[PDB]
Design a protein around this ligand. Structure first.
Ligand code: I33
Ligand code: I33
Ligand code: I33
Lengths: 396, 396, 396, 396, 396
């Protein structure tokens, strides 16, 4: 229309985009900064970066962009693109990405009385600190530091508005708790400029259904089969075969885990200790099995038990586990044959109790290793704080 | 020509690209928005993004870009590049990508009467929600939210036209069902501006031939060999060897699966339950085999059956499975030799029935584990909705 | 020089880059479009994109960029950068990449009589259809659709010139066959504008030496060792050990293959069927071995053969394979000892023929499984079209 | 305000951004360059690049950007964007990235007396030299070369200020030691221009808790089980089974290691030697086991010991390890039976000492291989310099 | 200063950046092109691209950028940014990257007499041909084609200067040999324009310490253990177990190798043949072991040797390897017992020589397979040209 064309001509008349729109060059310009979280794109522990899709709202007041409604009746608001009107230089301080702005400058709405609002969308990649302790059951606090880069305390008075979460599109992996904020001003090394800033911190809780079922559940089941060695009879030459196959089949899990675990020397993660515990329990099973096996094939008539094994593994431990354990030359020739058989029976009896001792050790170690696994798995998981709420929410 | 050069000079005379081309600054400008799907580039479940190659069509009416055909006979249409004429700021609301526009501004056609049409091509990366439940047999609905960013209800009246699918170049992985749309206007927190938008939703069905043959078919075959342990004789020291090798060879499948499965704690995927079922069936086979093995090498003369095994596994279960099961000193020396052989026969007979009990258990568990696998594999697959149509289309 | 400086001043005088350089605004401008293939960067089956490094040649005639050689003797040609003279908007229709142009605008040569030629280099990422059937022995046809975006039939008459392949730098993986082209014009949904285009199709043949030697050759060799189970004696408790280790060692190949195979449900690839055939042949070997093993450790005196096995595996199949298969009490005590030995001999004879039956089955299955593998491997490879030429070229 | 609008108009009056702001064109312009390290993004050994998030500070003095405070009372400082005032062209010399600047030009503060300061933020990817020797316990020195590109010694006198580390946000993987710097000027091949530069070197120490626990600790434990072969009795046919399974299960570690190790032929890394030592120790265990096994199943009555084994492995080594090791025809028939049994006893005795020799070798090799592993693991780790401080800090 | 401000004003007066700075428009402009290699970023065989960080030097003479030193005493040189003075359009012809220039336009130095020099830094990604034959011991020649894009022979006379390598920062993986160059002009299809160019070829030698130690050394060691099967006694049921475990553990190496090997069907790489040789040697070991095993468990009394084995493996091969290899009824009952034992001895003797034949074959195959491995490993490595220099440099 003729009024819109006319109004745009006075508005850009003698206008300098490099100038603060303050009427008096002695008072700071009040700028209201807010934030709207639309979704959490991804949280990557390896690079310790946080990708979020958010909206920004910068609102200030202009003095030269004012006009009377009566003179121009039809038009009420005007829009100016980037590079034609003064805008605040508020930007993310972290900005862990190649290009540092990440704001996608759009049109800037202008009031009928000079109140200018700016609503740019962008995808931000901030530098967060992923404290990976109690990894499946961890809560992360990520900060977003926003503030002006060239305007100090007396030039741009940065104010704060509460963050908006109307429309969040939940990720499904991380459960958002809340996004509080804070406004403060600090003194930097360069200058005597007190620089205000707005720091929005994001608190999110990691869901545990995927990690618990795909990682924690198989570990208990695989470790259970390593406990099944003591139930196999020693006759079947198969004890070490299943003893070492489970160990080989269980080292593969940290290969997946280490691909996700950041290589940070802050603290030993809970998942790292739990896997390490399974290494030792399965590893010590093979060592015990070797001791059991040599008790079976002891090659008798080559050394008797030192009389401590006859009383420990056959009287004390056994009670606990309810084991309950021309004719003259013809005669001489037959004499040797029967005596040889008699000596074979004596050797068999000596070897028989050697095998029974191995059975006692196997059964004794089964009870000892079983209670170790029960308290090791439970004890580590119980130690994690807020473990109960995650189970009560994700699982139950 | 001289007419084209002349016409371009009046057209750009006193023209402001920042002004809405409405003749009266009281009525909204009617803008027709449509869409044309050219192909689906890729659907990624891990990042929950949808990459599509589409075309856009924005058509509106201009008031200052009008001329008489008689005055300029040769020229009928003119084209203006970006930044020289007013264009709507319609953009994708989701825009899950670094740069937010993704439109590749091109020349804008102009009528002889002021009807301006704009047809920019681009590759869009929207943020979709991949509900991964019944993963091989899932249907995904992806939304595309388009609308103006700075013009409200009274400024830009956004209209809708039906989506165009003339030329789709089918992906081969996802089967397109349809792309319906909707026009609505909502109230936002910033302003009293009712903002219209056009939301095009894309419904696609995942094809199952690749996932069924490369993932589902081998799982049945590998689980079948784990069922073959009960057919192996216990004499060959090879039962646990094949019992645990199949288990080791079958854990590798979720390694491929987890690399594709998004780590979302929304619901347990169908493929996750089916793999978990195979874990337990194969895992319980090793536990049963250990019980069977200790029934074989029972070391007789160390405890008889409690008289419940003589009647259960030898009379009840066996009937079900059709098993059907100087001279005086010379005489004394020969007396011991024959008696020793007689005692060996008695011990062999006792051990013989111990081995037969193990054979009954093996055969009994073969029948029980077979029907479990048949109903577990079928039962999980039947539970998925629209399973029949995918088989009737992709396979048959 | 003074003439070059003077000439540039009249040339840009009253020049509008938005105007078609036609002298009469009623006839289309003839634009000659060609192509020069410099190399094929990469063909990716997963994303179905084709990356090529090519050159473009757009040549048209300008009316305002003309001058007399006599007036300016030294200068014969002039060059204008992008944004200063009118250029056609020909662009790739597919453009499967983030930015859509991929042309790297350079200087544009200008004749002494107005004939303007434009030779921009670029790397193009078109969207091809990789029909992966007979994957090692496949020929792919990739199209490149070029045409104007804003100028119709009556505005820009797009012509065609033959593609140039002078200098190709062969890739070494794909063998180029030829690059023919076509010029046609179609009617689109938007407008009554008949839009001409030039479609250059690229035909390339995949070389087979790498895929044949690294993938096809090991498969035959590994499957051969799975056939070696029937030659192992049943006494050595090692038949299932090598039966299942080969199967475990052979599942790893599709892990490499599936990483290359696109997940397209168009048709079952030849390499997929060939691997699936090896699964069944190796898988059925373990099933046969279990049947053979239970024929060995049959535990005699627990059931005789049903008299069909005595005649089938011992008379019919065996002929085919050339198998050819006080004193009174002293006497009574010795009577039992000899009779016990006699009964042992009878039991050994019964078990002896049980073992021989297992040997016959093993040898019989070796002949049957051998011919199956020979015709399965050859039969699948022969079915692929143009298999002979690839072997005659890549190998021989 | 009116004063800010007025001041900006004289400041940009007759101003050339291509001109050095020196009042006299005979003296170099003094530019103060500093640096502020905010965090270390990532150190990648494969590409030998160092990604850091740092801030820059370039401060110089301008002669034309001066004004009187009395004339313009309200305004004290002004800001000019890029491309409107002269700025130094200081840039990173290494710049191992696609775009070479990586500075994100921002507003430039201006004094009331002409002192201009410039504080651009950016993420820099310099080309470092990762000397990977003693890899878990290494200290890296990375250089950052900054200097002007077009201004020589007499044009831009580049000065140096101490680096700032107020706020570092420690990475958790690398421990920062310090960031010293240096200012020097060199003569280049192009010109007689002495070019000053500022080289900031970054010294960081890699933390060892993650690499020690996830890589070094399992290696000792896995190598311990390879040492357990000599404790297994030779009767259980399981020595090679555990001998070769550990070797198969231990080759997988360099697969993870080689994925991290850069392929640089500078020196053999400490982790490479330590893994290579474990290869030989585990590998030689299988060779020894084969020698031990053939001493067990020696098939007696086929060769006696050469009388050196009777004295070495049975008298010398055994003492070290405390081993301590009608009637006539009736008579003739019984004569053979007893003599046959007597010959069996003699053969058993000969085979008995053959088995005992294998037991001595097994035990002897257990002592020899144990001390080898203890000194090989400790000896390699001790050789690394500053090994003690890393253990005293990261672990203790 | 006032002189610098004044000089810049005449210099840009009536200056056209589109014009060649030649005083006479009949002679070509002499442009000197050189190169400085700073480092080799990476050489990637899969994509056949070469990433290098180099500097360029373009020097020409300008006619309009001249001034008298006396008139302007202080200033001696001036700098003009991109887009304000004429510059040559020399660019890399290969440019295997998204953006085609890769030059990072900087300030351009100007003499006091018109000699203009241009020194832009950049990271170039050229398209090289990696002839992967004798892969660990290969030398690659990579070309860099530089030349003008729009100026022909009579317009821009491109000259050449020797490449500079003062400061190379050796990569550590590739050993630079030299960078020679060449200047030539060719006739293209478009035009009668003879286009000069400068082609700098880079010759680099790959270092072998990393590839030799991490890949070649383990292959010899793993193949050695596959040769240890023939030393294992056949009694221990463990020959196939170690025979097939080594084969399973050795297929994993090409998985790493194929991830590095480009899929080019040019020639069979040396590393491919060496791995293929190890496949057959290890593979044939299992086949021989099966033949040996069936010679052990021959089940005697079921066929004698054909009298060729008695003379070949027991007389010829054995000599080579130094093997050296009421009363009447009482009497009748004892008669059978002794005769049964006598028949057992005869059967044992027949089986004894069957086992000895297997021992001869095992030992005979050990000698034959050992010399095969020695000449196969050495023979392949010796065939590679310049193998000796790499060992003499990288290793010794
Ligand atoms: O209403 C809005 N944005 C709409 C206006 N335009 C049209 C649709 C929407 C996006 C652009 C709002 C955006 C933000 C951002 C940060 C903080 C707050 Cl409190 C708000 S409220
Ligand atoms: O001759 C040429 N290009 C040269 C001219 N300049 C200098 C060297 C070369 C590149 C730039 C040609 C380029 C093309 C492109 C497409 C089709 C055809 Cl038939 C041709 S012929
Ligand atoms: O001297 C130089 N470059 C310095 C000048 N400026 C300041 C420091 C350096 C980089 C910019 C040189 C650069 C090149 C490039 C190619 C060939 C040659 Cl023979 C040379 S000589």
């Amino acid at each position: 229309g003729e009024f819109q064309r006319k109004l745009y001509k006075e508005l850009v008349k003698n206008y300098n985009p490099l100038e603060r729109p303050v009427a008096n060059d002695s008072q700071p310009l009040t700028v209201y900064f807010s934030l709207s979280l639309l979704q959490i794109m991804d949280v990557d522990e390896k690079n310790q970066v946080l990708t979020t899709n958010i909206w920004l709202q910068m609102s200030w007041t202009d003095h030269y962009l004012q006009w009377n409604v009566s003179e121009y009746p039809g038009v009420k608001t005007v829009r100016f693109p980037d590079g034609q009107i003064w805008k605040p230089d508020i930007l993310l301080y972290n900005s862990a990405d190649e290009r540092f702005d990440a704001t996608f400058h759009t049109n800037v709405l202008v009031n009928s009385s000079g109140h200018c609002q700016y609503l740019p969308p962008g995808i931000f990649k901030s530098s967060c600190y992923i404290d990976v302790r109690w990894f499946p059951f961890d809560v992360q606090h990520c900060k977003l530091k926003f503030g002006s880069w060239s305007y100090g305390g007396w030039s741009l008075d940065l104010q704060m508005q509460e963050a908006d979460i109307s429309g969040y599109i939940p990720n499904g992996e991380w459960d958002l708790v809340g996004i509080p904020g804070k406004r403060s001003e600090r003194f930097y090394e360069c200058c005597k400029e007190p620089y205000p800033d707005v720091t929005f911190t994001v608190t999110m809780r990691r869901r545990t259904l995927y990690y618990g079922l795909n990682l924690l559940i198989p570990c208990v089941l695989i470790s259970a089969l390593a406990l099944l060695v003591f139930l196999l009879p020693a006759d079947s030459g198969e004890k070490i075969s299943l003893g070492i196959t489970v160990l080989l089949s269980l080292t593969v899990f940290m290969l997946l885990v280490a691909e996700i675990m950041p290589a940070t020397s802050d603290s030993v993660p809970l998942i790292a200790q739990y896997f390490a515990s399974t290494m030792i329990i399965v590893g010590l099973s093979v060592v015990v099995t070797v001791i059991v096996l040599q008790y079976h094939h002891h090659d008798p008539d080559g050394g008797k038990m030192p009389k401590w094994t006859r009383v420990i593994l056959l009287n004390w431990c056994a009670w606990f586990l309810r084991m309950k354990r021309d004719l003259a030359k013809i005669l001489e020739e037959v004499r040797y044959i029967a005596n040889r058989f008699r000596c074979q029976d004596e050797s068999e009896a000596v070897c028989s109790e050697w095998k029974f001792a191995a059975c006692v050790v196997d059964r004794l170690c089964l009870m000892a290793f079983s209670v170790f696994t029960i308290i090791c798995t439970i004890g580590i998981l119980m130690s994690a704080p807020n473990f109960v709420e995650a189970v009560s929410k994700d699982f139950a």
